[PDB]
Amino acid sequence: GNFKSKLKKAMLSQQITKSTIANKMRLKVLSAREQSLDGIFEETKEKLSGIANNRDEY
Amino acid sequence: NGIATLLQAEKEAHEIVSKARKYRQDKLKQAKTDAAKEIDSYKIQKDKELKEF
């Protein structure tokens, strides 16, 4: 039974390796989504400062 | 009596043989350790198969 339990540990270890990679991959896409979004807001920072520099429509 | 003392010596020899029976069990306990090792060897073979997988 201990050998069977050791074999079950390998299955859990194999699941652990698969689970760690699967979770990391999902957050990598989300991190890229936020990084892409942070670029959009970063571009909005310049436009907001650009509107101020006009001093006519501002 | 002398005959009774000799009988007691035979009983003492049987008592020594009774002690030797425990030694015989102790001698058989060496095979028990081998049997226990064989039990672990079977688990080791099962573990080796699990390790291979």
SS3 of residue A55 by DSSP: coil
> Which residues are CB-neighbours of A15 under 8 A, at least 6 positions away?
none
Alpha-carbon distance A36 to nearest alpha carbon in chain B (angstroms): 43
> Which residues are CB-neighbours of B46 under 8 A, at least 6 positions away?
A3, A4
Alpha-carbon distance B39 to nearest alpha carbon in chain A (angstroms): 12
**Integer Cα distance of B53 and B51 in angstroms:** 5
Among A5, A7, A11, A14, which would you mutate to test the B interface (most chain B Cβ atoms within 10 Å of its Cβ)? Answer: A7
Identify whether the C-beta of residue A3 lies closer than 8 Å to the C-beta of residue B43: yes
Technique used to solve these coordinates? cryo-EM
Buried b (16+ CB within 10 A) or exposed e, B1-25: eeeeeeeeeeeeeeeeeeeeeeeee
**B42-to-A5, A9, B11, B28, B34 alpha-carbon distances in Å:** 15, 19, 44, 21, 12
**Integer Cα distance of A22 and A29 in angstroms:** 11
Residues in A closer than 8 angstroms to B50, CB to CB, are 3-4, 6-7, 10
Cited resolution, angstroms: 3.3
